[PDB]
Amino acid sequence: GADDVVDSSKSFVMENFSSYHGTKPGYVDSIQKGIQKPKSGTQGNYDDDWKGFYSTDNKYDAAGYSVDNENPLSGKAGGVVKVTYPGLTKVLALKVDNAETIKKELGLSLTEPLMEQVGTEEFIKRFGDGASRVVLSLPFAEGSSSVEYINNWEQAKALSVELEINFETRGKRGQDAMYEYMAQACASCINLDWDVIRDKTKTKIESLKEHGPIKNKMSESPNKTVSEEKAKQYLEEFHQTALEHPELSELKTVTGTNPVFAGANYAAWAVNVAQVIDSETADNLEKTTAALSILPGIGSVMGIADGAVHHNTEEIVAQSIALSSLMVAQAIPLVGELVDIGFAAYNFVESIINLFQVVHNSYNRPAYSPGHKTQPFLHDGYAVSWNTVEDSIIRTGFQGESGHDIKITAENTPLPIAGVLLPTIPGKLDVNKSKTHISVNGRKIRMRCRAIDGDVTFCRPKSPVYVGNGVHANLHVAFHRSSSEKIHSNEISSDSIGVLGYQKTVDHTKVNSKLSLFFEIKS
Amino acid sequence: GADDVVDSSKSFVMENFSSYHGTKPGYVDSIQKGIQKPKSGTQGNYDDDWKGFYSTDNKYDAAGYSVDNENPLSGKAGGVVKVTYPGLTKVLALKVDNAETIKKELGLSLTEPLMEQVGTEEFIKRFGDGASRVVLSLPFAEGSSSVEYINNWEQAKALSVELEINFETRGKRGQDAMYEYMAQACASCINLDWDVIRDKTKTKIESLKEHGPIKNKMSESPNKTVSEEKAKQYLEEFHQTALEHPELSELKTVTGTNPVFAGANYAAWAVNVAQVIDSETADNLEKTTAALSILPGIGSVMGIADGAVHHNTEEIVAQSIALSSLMVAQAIPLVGELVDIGFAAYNFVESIINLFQVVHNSYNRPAYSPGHKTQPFLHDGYAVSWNTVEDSIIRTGFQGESGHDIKITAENTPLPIAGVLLPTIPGKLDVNKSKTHISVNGRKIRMRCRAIDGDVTFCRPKSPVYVGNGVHANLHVAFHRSSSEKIHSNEISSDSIGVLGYQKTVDHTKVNSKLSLFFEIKS
Numbered sequence A, B: 001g002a003d004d005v006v007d008s009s010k011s012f013v014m015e016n017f018s019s020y021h022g023t024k025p026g027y028v029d030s031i032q033k034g035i036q037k038p039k040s041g042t043q044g045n046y047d048d049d050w051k052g053f054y055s056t057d058n059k060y061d062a063a064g065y066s067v068d069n070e071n072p073l074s075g076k077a078g079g080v081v082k083v084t085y086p087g088l089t090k091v092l093a094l095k096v097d098n099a100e101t102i103k104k105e106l107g108l109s110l111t112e113p114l115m116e117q118v119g120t121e122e123f124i125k126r127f128g129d130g131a132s133r134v135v136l137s138l139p140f141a142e143g144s145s146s147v148e149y150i151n152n153w154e155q156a157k158a159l160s161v162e163l164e165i166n167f168e169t170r171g172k173r174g175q176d177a178m179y180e181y182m183a184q185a186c187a188s189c190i191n192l193d194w195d196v197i198r199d200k201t202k203t204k205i206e207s208l209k210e211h212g213p214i215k216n217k218m219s220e221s222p223n224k225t226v227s228e229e230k231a232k233q234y235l236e237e238f239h240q241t242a243l244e245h246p247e248l249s250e251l252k253t254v255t256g257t258n259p260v261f262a263g264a265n266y267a268a269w270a271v272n273v274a275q276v277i278d279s280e281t282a283d284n285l286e287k288t289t290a291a292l293s294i295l296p297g298i299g300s301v302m303g304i305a306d307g308a309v310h311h312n313t314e315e316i317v318a319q320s321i322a323l324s325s326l327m328v329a330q331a332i333p334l335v336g337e338l339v340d341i342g343f344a345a346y347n348f349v350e351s352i353i354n355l356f357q358v359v360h361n362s363y364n365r366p367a368y369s370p371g372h373k374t375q376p377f378l379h380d381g382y383a384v385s386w387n388t389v390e391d392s393i394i395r396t397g398f399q400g401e402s403g404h405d406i407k408i409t410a411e412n413t414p415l416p417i418a419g420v421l422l423p424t425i426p427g428k429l430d431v432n433k434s435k436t437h438i439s440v441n442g443r444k445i446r447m448r449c450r451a452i453d454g455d456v457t458f459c460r461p462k463s464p465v466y467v468g469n470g471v472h473a474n475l476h477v478a479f480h481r482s483s484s485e486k487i488h489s490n491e492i493s494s495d496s497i498g499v500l501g502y503q504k505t506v507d508h509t510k511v512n513s514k515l516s517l518f519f520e521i522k523s
């Protein structure tokens, strides 16, 4: 019944219960006059059972609901307000978001929209625990630790509303105020001054234009349609010359080694832009942002590769954007259609500043790296992951066994799995070699394991293991503990299980493809 | 308690309960004399609680335990025997394989090895349901529908043993008898006559050697160490000439279009072999098989690409193996160390016949294709999967809602998600656009969906979505049903959800990267 849908351990009564609501440009002031079910719109939900007023415990999450709905990609963001219930409010945490289940389990009317019934006396009598009203709590989203609050429309009229932030009052370009506010969430942390980046970029685009060898490199330009193949060629040379400009120097240093950052990738990027921008698009930021957002390769100009944001100083990001701008201007005539001159310096910049902000925001948010929890590790054609979050945890402090499943497959042709590297601590974490195995399309293959140093055993499949399109494996590791003593950090040298892929005489030193699954020791 | 570890719905009592045991060369006859705990070895398990006699309900699975333990990769397989318990036997299906949990829950002694206690009168009294003995049942492996039977050593003495198959009696080369027996499992189905493939290959290797233009192409060969770069070059030309031989004609046709099957990949393969084979390895099949098994690229010679086994006639597989053999012979002198002449024609062939058999066996086994159940779809740098098996099921026949989670990330730099294609049937399967969203590192992004034909709606993220190393997304699709009528096959045009990746003007016709998640309609 009721404990199948309500999680009472995380339900509580609070006095002066507060939360946030993201508000659109046009309502930051009026919503402060009070909360009321609007006359236009879906009123909180497409589904009747879920119609009500929505808030979240996180003001940065509330902020993501503040963008003009007509231009959600590049419009103004309005603000955040904090709404508070006077007195006592019961926050009832639900284990499920299915309204038919909750009405059934909670034994309510199966007919009335659940959210109407939450605002009833009877419902508040039964679940309010003496609070003046009930608000439902659900997890905000996967990968988030916030909660979403679903308020009954009528009970919401009691909310007091105050301004958290009105982003438009900030007076910044684009969605600069919204993103600077969200960057506060992390104080590591990309906290760039976009006003400065915006200003240095302009100065740089201007200066590069005046540059004689640039003004010349441009003179070599076909200045009319040529295949991207020769447009790529003109562009790499152009890039090669612009990057010698004293104002794109630091950028010269930082993009020299990494292949993602190469001149070829800036040219591949510029060619892609010039080819998707027509005059109507070029004329509208929203549509410019809509088109730029679906192209591959933006990481080259962003300085984002391998899990890291390399271009992370206002100076270097401004150089990279200014270099990109100039090169779209060159690409437009050779591979596109429009007023090259215009777009490149204006809506191209406005729009790409916005995509930088979108991507920096994600990297500022807590996330799992490859091979952590259930995030896959993608490498050399293989995809591997802990089947579930508990598999990634090696529990300690007890005598007995555990089992841990790792999914393994590869994208296409049959790639071998040479074996696996596992941590061992005698007594506290032994490998049970009878129970450990690898299953290929259900075929169970036992392993032969051998000691190594670093308290690592190397296990190989008794028979050949290949994975690929249509062939998948489950590596099941069974650990055995003869001691009830807890594993100590000292005792463990590795924080991952290592699956070894195929062998390459990379460096003329035989090396195996390495795929890592990171674990955690607990209890 | 007890219903936390035993699954009584799948436990039963049977008269003349039968099962299979894979037996090693040396024991097919003697084990027929009766089952007895051996004096040497782990007696069924490394863990004491799990020591006992092991059997399986599947004779093809039993067959995978029959290979000489000293040369598990290429040794002889012994056989399968069927063991039967006279009278009544209780098969007790366990929900868990953790012996401490089962002893606790089943309230048994925490001290005695569980499997000793299963063979006790008291234990048989309590769980035998009137059977003369209890056997424990566990799922054989992930991706398998077999079961594993764990028999108490002492109760196992009552088993009657009969010969299923003695593979050695078959008189075949390598592990031909074992693999032909396992191929019976599927009657689609690779059921090759390896005797024929073995014979045609020899004939072909011999004939190619005599071939004048080949004997000549060989005359162009540096016949001494040259970098793989020039060894690759000699090899592609050599391949290009050998494939013109009338005996490798069909092969000429079938490998002409697919890039995996190209002459360059046969040369990349031959170079990899010549470089990992030394004289000692070349002299031992086991070690030859151990080294060949960890190299990438075998799919080129196998004719295996995109989930399919293309070389599936004895004639074409013999041509491909004969061509591969000849080319290792050429590669050895240029990039390796040994008696090129020897290995290539002998242990190289014996060994690669075995890897073909290993890989054909996997493709003969039931498996999930990319994007089915929780198998990921790997494409264009992206990895996507249904988070759990239930997510992949769209249930029908009721009024209400469902939610379905799809994991999304990409291997490195930030790749965009343009939107998603979802099936719609009015009333029976509507998209609830309030509840449907995509979460990027916890950032919840709503969608705007638009109709299409084929009862498909196209939904785009309100804001830009990029995934990559360190940035992952959860696409949560919420479906709503206003009708309690079941979805009919007629009504649904698609069997997958389509995630759309970045855009490419591939064909000079703008195309999006397509990632598919296949669903099933039930109830």
Ligand SMILES: Nc1ncnc2c1ncn2[C@@H]1O[C@H](CO)[C@@H](OP(=O)(O)OC[C@H]2O[C@@H](n3ccc(=O)[nH]c3=O)[C@H](O)[C@@H]2OP(=O)(O)O)[C@H]1O
Binding pocket: A020, A021, A022, A023, A024, A027, A030, A031, A032, A034, A035, A036, A037, A038, A041, A042, A043, A044, A045, A046, A052, A053, A054, A055, A056, A061, A062, A065, A069, B433, B434
């Ligand atoms: N005086 C007012 N009293 C009440 N509402 C007012 C008032 N003034 C303006 N509003 C707006 O009215 C709508 C419902 O409250 C909300 O905006 P939306 O643009 O429809 O908001 C878009 C969606 O965001 C949801 N959402 C918004 C912000 C948030 O923090 N959490 C959340 O989930 C909304 O429920 C809405 O859902 P539905 O579109 O599915 O109805 C809200 O901002």
Ligand SMILES: Nc1ncnc2c1ncn2[C@@H]1O[C@H](CO)[C@@H](OP(=O)(O)OC[C@H]2O[C@@H](n3ccc(=O)[nH]c3=O)[C@H](O)[C@@H]2OP(=O)(O)O)[C@H]1O
Binding pocket: A433, A434, B020, B021, B022, B023, B024, B027, B030, B031, B032, B034, B035, B036, B037, B038, B041, B042, B043, B044, B045, B046, B052, B053, B054, B055, B056, B061, B062, B065, B069
């Ligand atoms: N007369 C006999 N009575 C009993 N055993 C005899 C007899 N003659 C030979 N044996 C062998 O003795 C061992 C235990 O029964 C088995 O072989 P293994 O090579 O140790 O077998 C290798 C492993 O395969 C397991 N296994 C084998 C076949 C099978 O179908 N299922 C399964 O899980 C075994 O329990 C064994 O585990 P442990 O190594 O972890 O002990 C078995 O084939």
